[PDB]
Design a protein around this nucleic acid. Sequence first.
RNA 1: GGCACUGCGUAG
RNA 2: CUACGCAGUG
Lengths: 62, 814, 115
Amino acid sequence: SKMSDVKCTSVVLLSVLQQLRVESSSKLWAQCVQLHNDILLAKDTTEAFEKMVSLLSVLLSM
Amino acid sequence: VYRAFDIYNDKVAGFAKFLKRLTKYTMADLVYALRHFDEGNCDTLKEILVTYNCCDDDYFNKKDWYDFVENPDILRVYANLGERVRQALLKTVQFCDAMRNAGIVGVLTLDNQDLNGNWYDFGDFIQTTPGSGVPVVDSYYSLLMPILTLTRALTAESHVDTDLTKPYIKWDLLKYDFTEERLKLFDRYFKYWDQTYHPNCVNCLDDRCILHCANFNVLFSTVFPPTSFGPLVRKIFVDGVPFVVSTGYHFRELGVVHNQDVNLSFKELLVYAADPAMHAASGNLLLDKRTTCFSVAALTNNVAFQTVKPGNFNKDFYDFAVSKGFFKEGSSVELKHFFFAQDGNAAISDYDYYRYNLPTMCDIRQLLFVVEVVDKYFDCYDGGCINANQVIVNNLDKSAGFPFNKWGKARLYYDSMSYEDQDALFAYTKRNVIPTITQMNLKYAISAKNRARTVAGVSICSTMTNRQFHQKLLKSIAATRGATVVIGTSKFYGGWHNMLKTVYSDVENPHLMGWDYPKCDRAMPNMLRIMASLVLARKHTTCCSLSHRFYRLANECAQVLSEMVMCGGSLYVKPGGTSSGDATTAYANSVFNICQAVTANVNALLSTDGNKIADKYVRNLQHRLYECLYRNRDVDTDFVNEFYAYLRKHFSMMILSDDAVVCFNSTYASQGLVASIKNFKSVLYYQNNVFMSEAKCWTETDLTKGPHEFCSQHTMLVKQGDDYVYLPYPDPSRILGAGCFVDDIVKTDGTLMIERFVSLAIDAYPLTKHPNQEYADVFHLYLQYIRKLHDELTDNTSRYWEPEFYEAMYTPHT
Amino acid sequence: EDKRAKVTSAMQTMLFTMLRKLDNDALNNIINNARDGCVPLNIIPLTTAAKLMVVIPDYNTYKNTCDGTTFTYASALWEIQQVVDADSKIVQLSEISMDNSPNLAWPLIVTALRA
RNA sequence: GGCACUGCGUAG
RNA sequence: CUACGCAGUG
Ligand SMILES: [Zn+2]
Ligand SMILES: [Zn+2]
């Protein structure tokens, strides 16, 4: 589908962000956690893709 | 119009609604509204709140205006009435004095006192010689007790000369013995409560006296400054170097307790190190503005923030599942269970949930009768103290708490001490109080909600002594089949079917129902936890004396109920609740659950009109229930047995520490002779200080469908061996999530997955018999996956992936 | 027995070394203020500890509690020695302001010494 | 990096 | 039965 796979990809990207020492920074990790927890708890695919894009942008800033 | 009346006559007895300056409402209406709470019909409560300036109607337009957890501001609104309640109390005493000064003997009821505190009653009064009048205030005070701490009626005792406008009272910062103040408080408000009150529960005579005195202390400890409660420390001279050690404790509920081995060896070193005295004395002062919970000190040079990393993802399982047609749009099975990551503020924000734990004063007569009835649910068990060599410990590779986690696991401490040392320590705990420190850790597991879960890791002294105290009774409860408490009764091998048949046994019009406790581990009153410990310790009538059992109880109170909690390297005080890492968490929780169910049944049977009851036996049972509740001081074993039998016939309970299934005669409940969902809602509102919603509590009419949920398991009646049995199946989303999302990456490759998936296919076999093809296909998905893993890894092994393996574990032969 | 000896030695060393950190200047006075010689544990940090740590979640609490370089707590006057953020980095006093509050990594741990 | 219970699986 | 691992439940 389009919801389960985006949730799984959000999980893997948060995991790789954590491996990238993001959790040292309080604010960046808090934003990443909020995005990931709202993606997983989301029921609308539009919000899922929006927060997925935002989380990917946070990953790509470095 | 309907008014709340408390009646005790030759025909009807109870506390129920009847058809019948002077205010519109009386004190009994306030007590009834706050005790029997129904959000559908709150008109009397709303009128009472608005009329006396506690709030305005615009406050009620918002949703959740009644919920404690969602709208904590209601705690202020109720408190805005507390002073009024206090005035009533004072006037009550005056009234009693007048009667004692007029030679009048009477029974004081709530309905005769208007909300301003005036008494407009002069009937039921028998003249006697002046000066010898004896007011009867058991029912009045006993029913008014839960409203005294809900409305915080004793706040004005914290101000100078008892004036709400005047500033606080500057108690000496060094004071710890508030006994004289407790005597003054008791003699000012409860002057005519005849039972003797011991501010220090060392002086108490037995379990019921402990409950009564602790109930009064819980109310009286809200006046005193919170810095006085906690361990009392004293400077001793060990070999000439000055130590500071705890030589006592101050309990909000048990008063001042002093150690008996105050003297000024590995056991003595453990008593010193487990003590929070040295840590909280050498540590830097800490002021945590993140939480409203009282803070003690900082043991490190920095505050620690712990982050929960996201769970791993099994690509292989997800790919296989979507190759089998799962996870499509509009399906029934989805991924609803994930590892929810947390930030650095999660631990302290979850510890802050203890703001839901309020000082709750219980209905003491009701609580005493309810503990008498609850003890009947544990008479088929035997317990007692055992020596160190009889203790069985499951895992010796667990943490030993703080500060003991710095030096090794619990295995090191169990190997270091000889059995004589452990026995000496246990005997020490029978004469002294040993405060400990419990860590809070964050849990890392599959969950369906973004909230984090904290586990309270207890120290080793508490674990050892509580094991020696309670393990015999715990193993007795865990090895008894067919009783109310189903801990230790497996759902496998026909276990679920036997459990269900036991619950259904001999009920005339059997319906099922269930409920949940919201914030059970944080909102529990301290009195109920004390009662649970007393029920568990009642099995020591011959091995332990009274003083030994009281000092043991003080040990659980100081190490489980109000211990020092080390979060992130900082010492806070726990306001109450339960420790999820305690030795006897499940069994004390089961006692608490049975208590709440019995209280619901008592409230249901006493709030019935009684006159309209068409059954003479039930009417007489209600009359004798009121008699044995608010009229008899000593225990009545015959009526306790009769009420226990009545409940066991018309109210069959299946209890596991939080999750309960009740099979009840539907006719009786619909008539009001048995607890319903609304009775449980009222009971949890006025005791547990929490609102229970109808979304999370369910009812079932047809027994064939079975319970809607028990232990997060649905149930279904199927046919096997020409026999109709009840099989439990889980939510398939939970099993699919457990398969997809893993705790550690190591469980993504290797042999381990096989066993894991076996234990997931065992728990997903019943879904095969579900009518839905998706639920049935979950099981075949798991079996094909196990087969594929076995093929990738490459007579005795083929039996893992055949359905006969998982079929054999639901046939009751083994 | 060797492991028992090691654990006893470690526990004794911890108690002794941490007792070195324990100050008897004000402890003696507060014990003497008590007739029985027993004092609550919660009072020892308030009246004897020299260093104080305050954790500030938001700027409102900061300006309410410890706005100035010297503030008050437990009826005592404390002077700020350091301020750190949740990333364990030094934060100067001039940096903490309503304009710059969104740029700081809250909560802030402020460390002060008793004056 | 906690308590309890249950069920698996490999070993005498 | 005793050890270790896993899974599920509160
Ligand atoms: Zn007593
Ligand atoms: Zn005993």
